[model samples]
Target: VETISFSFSEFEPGNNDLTLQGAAIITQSGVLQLTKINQNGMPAWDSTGRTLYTKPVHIWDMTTGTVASFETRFSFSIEQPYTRPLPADGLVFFMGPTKSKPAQGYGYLGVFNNSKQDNSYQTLAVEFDTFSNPWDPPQVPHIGIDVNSIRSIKTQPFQLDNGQVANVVIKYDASSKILLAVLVYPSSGAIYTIAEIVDVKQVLPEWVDVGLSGATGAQRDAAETHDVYSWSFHASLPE
Candidate 1:
C-alpha cells in the first residue's frame, strides 16, 4: 500500500501548487479567496471561481479495479462583507475526470456547466448550498452529495455562516463504496453529516482532479464571498 498526502494550514502569498481561475485569488493575508467582491473590473453577479490542485491524484487501480480509500478536511467561510440577504450562493469540495471550466454561475456549483447535458458528465461533489433550488431539497443552506447531476442523492441540514468558520471532514471507504461528509461548526461544536454509496469505478477513471469551487447568482440578493482557510487531504492506494 502507498499513501499520498497534502496539507495547507493556510495558503502563503504567491503559492503555485493550486490553479486559480475566474475570481479566485490568494490573499496576502494567506487565505484562498474563491470569489472576489467589490471589484471595479470584475463582474459581481454570476461571479464564479475555482481553485484546483495543479496535479491529479490517483484514486483507484484501473486494471485491478481496486478503489482507494481517502479522507479530507478543510475549513471555509461564506459570510460577513458579502451578506445582505444571506447571499443565496455557496461552494463545493469536488472531484471529476476533468478540471472543467466554471459552471454556468450559481446553481450548478461549478461541477458541471449548463452548456452540456448534465448526465453526460462524470463527477462527484459535496455541496454547501445557501439557497435551495426547485430541484434541491426544501431545506435551505444544506449540504448534499451529488453525482452526475445537480439534484443530490443525499442531503444534510447545514448553515451558510454565522460569522464563524466551518470545518468539513469527508471520508471515502473503498470496500463499502460509501462516501461520508461531516460538517463541523467549531465555535458552536455543531455537527452535520451526509453520505452515500458511490462507486467511483462506475463514474470516474483511474485518477481525477480535485478542488474547491464557488458561484454566486443575482436572482434574489447580492453576491457573496467564498474562502478556504485551510485544507488537508490524503489517499492510500492498494498495490
Candidate 2:
C-alpha cells in the first residue's frame, strides 16, 4: 500500500490560505488544533479493521481570524455501539473506517450525532446542519438545509456576505461524485448551496485518507467561531 501523489496546487501558501509541510502529506496548518480526536490509533490497531487510506477534498474559508474551527473525518467500529456521540460543533465522516466517532444522529448525514451507538456499516453523510433537531423536522431540522437522502435542502441558509465575516465554503466532487455544501459570503460574492445533488456512495470509501477535522459546537449567529481559511484539492489524477 504505497501510492502517493498530491497537489493542492503544489502545497498552496503564497497567501492562498495555508497548506504547508512538504505541501500535503497532511498539513493542519502546523498544528492548528484537533488531533486524531477519537480516531483511536497508535499501534493498538484493530478498531475493527482500521482504514483511512486517502481521498478527501475539504476547502473551507471562514474568512480568517485564527481560522480552523471545524472540518472533520471519521472511522473505526469494531463492534456494537462503541461510544459515538458528539456533534455540537460537528464532525463525523466514516462510511467504513477512519476512527473519529462518538456522538450520533442529527440530519442529512449527522446521523446519531457521531456514533452514539456505533451500529457499523455506514453510508452517505454531509451534514453542515447547525441545530434545532426535533428529530429533524420531517427531515428538515437544524437551520435551513438538509440532505440525508435528498428530501430537501436549499432554503438559502448560511450567511455573512458583508454581514461581517462568516465566509464559508465546502465542496466535494470526487470527480463528479458530488457532496457540496456551499456558504461563501466572501465580501459579497454571495453563494449558498446547503447540500445539493449529493451521491457520495457509501459515504466515500475507495482507498481513503481524505480527512481533516475541527469542532466548536455548531453555530450560525451569536458571532460564529470555527475556521479553516484555505484548503485546496482538484483531481483528475492519472496522466
Candidate 3:
C-alpha cells in the first residue's frame, strides 16, 4: 500500500472528511467538540462521549515492505466551567484499523467499546487522563500509553497550565521501535516528556486510522470541552 501524510490546520465548519460518531461535532467556530457543555441541563455522564477519526490510511506502506515512521503534532485542552468541582475524565489520541464507537465508560477513555468481556477493539492510544478511576492507580493528571486495553502500559505525571491549551508532539520511529511524546507549555515554555521508548507497533495495526476521543462522568458539576487547534500526521520521519 502507498504511504500517506495528513494534516488539519484547524477544524472548521463543513469539514466532512473527518468522521464524527456519538456526541462529536464540528462547532460553528471551527473547533471539534467531543461532548457538549452539560451545564445547559444535560445530565451528568449519561454515557455521553465522542470520537473523531480521519478517513482511513495505509500507515505501514505495505508495498514497500518498509515500516513507516511517523509524527503527529496537536493542540488540545479540557475546559470545565468554573463552577465544577472536578473534571470527570480525559481524552486520547489513538490509532486503529476502523472507526469505533463503544458503550461509554469513565475508564474506557472513549477508545474501548466496553469491558473486556463484551468487546475487544484494537488500538494504540496516548491517553491524557485527569481523574482517577477504580482501575487506575491513585494519581493526579497524567499521560499514559494504552495498548488495546484502557489500562495503560506506562504512565507519567503531567501538569496543566491553569486551563490553558496544551501542545503535544508524538513521534514513532520504525527503525528504533521507539514511541516518544512531548507535552509543551506555551505559557512558560516549559516542556514535559510524557513517554519515551514506547513500543507502539507491538499493539497497533499496520494500517490504521488516527483519531481523538473524550468523555465526562456524572460526579462533575460541569461538562468538559475537548478542542483540537491543529493536527498533522506524516508517514515518513522528519527531515
Candidate 4:
C-alpha cells in the first residue's frame, strides 16, 4: 500500500503519512502549514517506497528536529499549475537527531542550490532546469551548481511542456566528506545526470541514517509533483 501523509484530514496507510506536529516557525512564514503526526510515522510526503523531504540546513544550537546519525534526502515539490517556471522546484536535507521532534531535522547542517540562492555561504546545488529566469544566461533552461541559496532563480521564465518534471538526488560519502547530487528527469524517460559534487565536511559526521520530510506549496507543475518512483543505496549497519 502506498501512502502520502500531510495532515490531509484523509490519506492511505503506511505508504506516506504525516506524523510531526505543527511548528512555531509556521507562524512567521504563515505560508507553511503545521507538520502533523500520523500513522505511517512522520509525513513521508512521498508515496510508498518513494521519496521524502526534510529541513537540511541548520544554525548552531538552533532549535530544530533531531534524528539519528544518518544520511537522507528531503524533496520540495512544485506541482502542476506552476505560475513561475524556471526551476520553481527545490529540496532540503535535515541531519536530525531522534527521527522525532519538529523543525529542520538535526545532525549537523548543509544545503545545495542550482540557480544560486545564497552563494556567500557553504551550500551546493545543481538545477535540472526547464524554464528561464532573470538570473539565467539568456533565461534558458540550464544545469548549474551554486554554493548557497540563489536569490534570482530565473533559468527559464515561460513554462513549457505543462507536464515536464524532474528530481535531485543527494548522497553523502562521509569517509571522503563528499556530497554529490544527481538530477533525474521523468519526462525524458527517467534519465539521470550528475548535477554537482562538493565536499561537505563542515558539520556532518561519518555515517548516518536517512529519512524523508514532507512537501510544500500548493499545486504547481508535474516536474514538482513528480512523486518519487523508487530508490536504493548501500550503507553500514547500526553499531
Candidate 5:
C-alpha cells in the first residue's frame, strides 16, 4: 500500500501542512509562492535571496530493511518579469538532512554552492533550471537530477512557460535503484524525462526532509517567480 506523507491543494488558501523555512509564502490564491523577485528591487538580490519550504515530518525510513519507494507530483509555474531582459536561476525539489537546513548555491538551484567541490552537504534533488550556467552541460530550461553536486548526472531539455503551469512527476524505486522524472504540459501533450540510477542510502539518511527551493541570480534582471498549485508525496512500495 502507498503511504502518503504529505499532500497540498495549494489553490485552497490557509492550509498549514507545510512549514515556510525562508522566503516561501502561501499566497491568498492558495499558491505556494517560492520566490518573489519584486520584493527588493528589479535586478537586485534580497537578503534572503533563496526561499525554501518543506514538510514538517520526515517521509521515509531509510534504516529499515524493507525496500522503500516514493512518488511526488506537483504543478509549478515560473513567471518572468515583463520588462527584464533575462530570465532567472530556477527551482528545485530536494530531499535532504533537515527541514531547516537548505542546501547552498543560489544559481545552482539551491542544491550546490559556488565552490562546487564539496560533497559534505550532500542532498538529492531534481532541478528545473531556467538559466544555464557556464558549468552546466550545454542546456537551458532543462530538468536534471542532482546528487550532491550541481552538475546533474542526467538531464533533458524542458520547455518552461512564463505564465503557464506545468505538471511534474518524480518517482524512485529502491529495488531497482532508479530515479525517474517526468514533466507534462497539459496545454499540449508534451512530455520530458530525466532519469538516473542511484542508491539513496549512500547519499541521504534514513529519514529526510522534502521541500522546494528557488533563486534568482545577481545579474538576472528578469524577476523570476515560482508558484506551486498543488503537491503530493507518497512513500511506499507496490504490493
Candidate 6:
C-alpha cells in the first residue's frame, strides 16, 4: 500500500501547509484559532471560520474502484470568549471537493448552508456540536457523523466543558466501510465512541480537500471561541 500523511503539532507561522479563511487564523502561540472576536473579545453574530490543508490524498483508484483507508486525529477546544457566555453552533471537520463557507443560521456548524442545510457540493463531515437546535437531540452537546448533510445520521452526546481540550479520532476502514469517531478527555480518562457504516466509494470522489471549519450564529448572544492545537492524518491506498 502507498501512504500519504501530514502531521501538524502546531500551526506555527511559515512552517505549515494550512491556509486560513474568514474567521480562522493562527494565533501567536501557534494554535489554529478558528473564530474571530471583537474588541470586547466576543465573536460577531453570523461569523464563520475555516482552514484547509492544501494537499491531496487519493481516496480511491478510479479504474480499480479500490477505496483507501484513512485516519485523522486532532486536539481542539471550544470556550466562552473573554467576558462572554458559551457560544452557539460548533466546530466541524470535513472532506469536500472545495472549501466552503459556514451556514449563516444558528446551526449547520459550517458544514452546510441554510437554504438546503445540505448540498450539491458533496462532503463527509464530523461535527462536535455545542448548541441544541430544533432538529438536534435537545439540550445537550453531541458528536455527529454526517455524510453530505447537517442532520447527522448517527450521533453521540458528550458534554464538553468550556476551555478544556478534547482529543478526537475519526477513522474509516475502506474494506469494511466502517467509520468510527472517538472522543477523549485525557485528564478525565473519558472515552466516548460513535460509529457508522459508510461507503466512501459510493459517497465521495477519488480525491478531495480535507479541513476543519467553525461558526458562531446571529441568533445567539454567546460567542464560542474554537481552537485547534494539533492534527495528524494518515491515508493509505492499495497500489
Task: Please give the distance, in angstroms, between residue 113's alpha carbon in candidate 5 and its true position after superposition.
Answer: 2.6
Count the clashes in each prediction. Answer: 0, 41, 2, 63, 2, 0
Q: Rank the candidates by lDDT, best first.
A: 6, 1, 5, 3, 4, 2
lDDT for 150 (candidate 5): 79
lDDT by residue (tens digit), candidate 1, 21-73: 78888888888878775555232556788888777888888788778898989
Cα RMSDs of all predictions?
2.7, 18.6, 3.5, 11.7, 3.3, 2.4
TM-score of 2: 0.22
Q: How far does residue 202 in candidate 1 sit from its true spot (Å)?
A: 0.6
Writing each residue's lDDT as its tens digit, candidate 3 over 2-36 gives 45777787887666667777777676666777666
Off by over 4 Å in 2: 7-115, 119-206, 213-223, 229-239
List candidate 4 segments past 4 Å from native. Answer: 1-12, 15-78, 82-89, 99-169, 174-176, 189-201, 205-209, 214-226, 229-233, 237-239
Better of 4 and 5 by lDDT: 5
Ranking by TM-score: 1, 6, 5, 3, 4, 2
lDDT (tens digit, per residue) of candidate 5 on 166-202: 8999999888899999998887778998899978777
Residue-level lDDT of model 4, residues 15-49, one tens digit each, is 33223233211212222222221343223221211
Give a tens-digit lDDT track for model 6, residues 121-212.
47888888877777777745799988877778888999776688999999999888999999998868788999999888766767877888
Tens digit of per-residue lDDT, candidate 2, span 1-239: 12233333222224333222211122235322221223242111111111122444222222321111122222111111112232233222323333444222222232334323232433344443333344433321122322333223344434322213323445455345445555544456655555455443433333233333323232221111122333333333222
Each candidate structure's TM-score, on Cα atoms with residue i matched to residue i, is 0.90, 0.22, 0.84, 0.38, 0.84, 0.90
For each candidate, what is the lDDT?
Answer: 0.79, 0.30, 0.68, 0.32, 0.70, 0.79
TM match of model 3 to true structure: 0.84
Off by over 4 Å in 1: 39-43, 80-86, 115-119
Q: Where does candidate 1 have its weakest 10-residue lDDT segment?
A: 37-46
TM-score of 5: 0.84
Q: Residue pairs in steric clash, candidate 5?
A: 10-30, 62-206
